[PDB]
Amino acid sequence: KSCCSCCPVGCAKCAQGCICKGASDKCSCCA
Numbered sequence: 001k002s003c004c005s006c007c008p009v010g011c012a013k014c015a016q017g018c019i020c021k022g023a024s025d026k027c028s029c030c031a
């Protein structure tokens, strides 16, 4: 399933959950 509508998939920065706080269209924690 999609972790966030900003990251693709299998994002290590979203593997242990969702450490993405940046945004939805563009973040800066999974650049």
Ligand SMILES: [Cd+2]
Pocket (backbone or CB within 6 Å): 004, 005, 006, 007, 020, 023, 024, 027, 030
């Ligand atoms: Cd994201």
Ligand SMILES: [Cd+2]
Pocket (backbone or CB within 6 Å): 007, 011, 012, 013, 014, 020, 029, 030
């Ligand atoms: Cd991510």
Ligand SMILES: [Cd+2]
Pocket (backbone or CB within 6 Å): 003, 004, 007, 013, 014, 017, 018, 019, 020
């Ligand atoms: Cd996420």
Ligand SMILES: [Cd+2]
Pocket (backbone or CB within 6 Å): 007, 013, 019, 020, 021, 022, 027, 028, 029, 030, 031
């Ligand atoms: Cd991020």
